[PDB]
């Protein structure tokens, strides 16, 4: 049994009180106060629509994925990854999201480069034919107390994304990366498309998610086990308040 399974088993034993203190212990987060306040007032400039803009910015600013040309954003939700890419110097952003009951709807914004963005709700990516693009982003993977449900969801995402991969820049969420069948798929995918699995410091401890990014190399099993050990160790000590960082200012204007 994997270190990830032992982490999931321990996470599932936590009381709501314990879970809420564990989930942010020692993580990094952006202060969303100003953005939430502005969004509640219907302000359409500067503010990121979600924590997602800062989450993707973390990989981009480290050259792990370098968005360029036509960007496809799978599971765009409110549009945080889309509006962030829209301001990047290297042309078009197309976001798809399911929407409807229990899902986020795209939020219309006037942040920098809004005019090159089209977000489409009512779209289940599991029924979409692949489109030509220069950057493929995917942030899909719903957490579940069941690791076997999470394993099925992760494989489904990895099988779905592959036909969109054609020597392009990519950043794909891998919800549950520790299950041996997931590792098998990731290893096969890394041999063909390259890239590496990376843990984002903005991820909560309540998810084992890692992202498969195009610009990197490394041992997937080693990176996964290092994350399992990190998350397991964070159950040991009293809550460490999260490291607080500034949220992104996405500005205003057309491109
Ligand atoms: C983690 S959120 C994305 C956050 C986004 N990256 C941002 O920056 O705001 C994942 C989104 O995927 C959507 N989603 C889940 N399953 C989907 C599917 N089958 N097709 C399309 N969208 C889906 C969810 O509704 C949710 O809004
Ligand atoms: C559990 C949860 C948490 C956050 C959200 C969100 O969007 O931050 C969410 N969202 C929703 O439920 N969305 C939703 C609810 C109802 C309808 C409908 F049917 F048309 F009336 C449409 C949508 N898109 C659910």
UniProtKB/Swiss-Prot annotation:
The protein's name: RNA-directed RNA polymerase NS5
Topology of the protein relative to the lipid bilayer: Peripheral membrane protein
Stated role: Replicates the viral (+) and (-) RNA genome, and performs the capping of genomes in the cytoplasm. Besides its role in RNA genome replication, also prevents the establishment of cellular antiviral state by blocking the interferon-alpha/beta (IFN-alpha/beta) signaling pathway. Inhibits host TYK2 and STAT2 phosphorylation, thereby preventing activation of JAK-STAT signaling pathway.
Location of this fragment in the whole protein: 2497 to 2752 of 3390
Record-listed S-adenosyl-L-methionine binding positions: 50, 80-81, 97-98, 124-125, 140, 211
Active-site residue numbers: 55, 139, 173, 209
Organism: Dengue virus type 3 (strain Philippines/H87/1956)
Residue(s) carrying Phosphoserine: 50
UniProt subunit comment: Homodimer. Interacts with host STAT2; this interaction inhibits the phosphorylation of the latter, and, when all viral proteins are present (polyprotein), targets STAT2 for degradation. Interacts with serine protease NS3.
């Amino acid at each position: 049994e994997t270190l990830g399974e032992k982490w999931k088993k321990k996470l599932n034993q936590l009381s709501r009180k314990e879970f809420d203190l564990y989930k942010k212990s020692g993580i990094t987060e952006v202060d969303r106060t100003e953005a939430k306040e502005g969004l509640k007032r219907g302000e359409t400039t500067h503010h990121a629509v979600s924590r997602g803009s800062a989450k993707l910015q973390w990989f981009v600013e480290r050259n792990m994925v370098i968005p360029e040309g036509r960007v496809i954003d799978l599971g765009c939700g409110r549009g945080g990854w889309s509006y962030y890419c829209a301001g990047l110097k290297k042309t078009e952003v197309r976001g798809y999201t399911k929407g409807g009951p229990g899902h986020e709807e795209p939020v219309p914004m006037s942040t920098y480069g809004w005019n090159i963005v089209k977000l489409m709700s009512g779209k289940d990516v599991f029924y979409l034919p692949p489109e030509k693009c220069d950057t493929l982003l995917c942030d899909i993977g719903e957490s579940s107390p069941s690791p076997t449900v999470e394993e099925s969801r992760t494989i489904r995402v990895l099988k779905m994304v592959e036909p969109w991969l054609k020597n392009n820049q990519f950043c794909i969420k891998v919800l549950n990366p520790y299950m041996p069948t997931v590792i098998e798929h990731l290893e096969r995918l890394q041999r063909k498309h390259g890239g590496m699995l990376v843990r984002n410091p903005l991820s909560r401890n309540s998810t084992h998610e890692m992202y498969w990014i195009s610009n990197g190399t490394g041992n997937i099993v080693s990176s996964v086990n290092m994350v399992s050990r990190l998350l397991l160790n964070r159950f040991t000590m009293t809550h460490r308040r999260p490291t607080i960082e500034k949220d992104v200012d996405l500005g205003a204007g057309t491109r």
